[PDB]
């Protein structure tokens, strides 16, 4: 990704954020390719081949994205340049643009690394975002279901579609949970 407008150390949450979220995710990716299916249909809804590969595609075109910071098929921004983060909301995406940036809260209300399974953080909120972009892996994914049980009591299409689906899927992967 492209990484600009940044001041502080949050321009160190978010390098470090890219980072995790490039090993979460190809871990991720690794798990569909590989892992256990039963997992995988946990948050997938379907242990079908076709259904697999199109996550890890996914997975490891978001692992690409967020490995650079100056290049890449994205901008990120540090801070929303424009007043488009609404309440409650850590960050959003232009997918018309390819273009991310994080709400303040991002950096006051995450941690980087969550512990608690399903739990929200830096990393994987990061993750979400890519897979909206569709520069990264088309088509961009949707916000169908936020959090553990919307997201998983979604239909197999609607999951596949979901950006949540892949932040759970690949905390999920890292805890062993
Ligand atoms: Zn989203």
Not at 126 to 144: C, M, S, W
Request: hydrophobic content about 30%; glycine content about 6%.
């Amino acid at each position: 990704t492209e990484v600009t407008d940044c001041k502080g150390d949050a321009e160190s949450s978010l390098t470090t954020a890219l980072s995790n979220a490039a090993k979460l995710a190809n871990q991720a990716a690794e798990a569909a390719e590989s892992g256990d299916e039963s997992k995988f249909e946990e948050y997938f809804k379907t242990t079908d081949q076709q259904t697999r590969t199109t996550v890890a595609e996914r997975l490891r075109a978001v692992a690409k994205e967020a490995g650079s910071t100056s290049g890449g098929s994205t901008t990120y921004h540090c801070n929303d340049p424009y007043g488009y983060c609404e309440p409650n909301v850590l960050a959003y995406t232009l997918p018309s643009k390819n273009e991310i940036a994080n709400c303040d809260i991002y950096y006051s209300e995450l941690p980087p690394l969550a512990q608690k399974c399903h739990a929200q953080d830096q990393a994987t909120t990061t993750l979400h975002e890519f897979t909206h972009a569709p520069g990264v892996y088309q088509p961009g994914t949707e916000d169908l279901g936020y959090g553990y049980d919307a997201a998983t009591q979604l239909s197999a299409q609607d999951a596949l579609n979901n950006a949540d689906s892949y932040a759970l899927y690949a905390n999920a992967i890292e805890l062993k949970c």
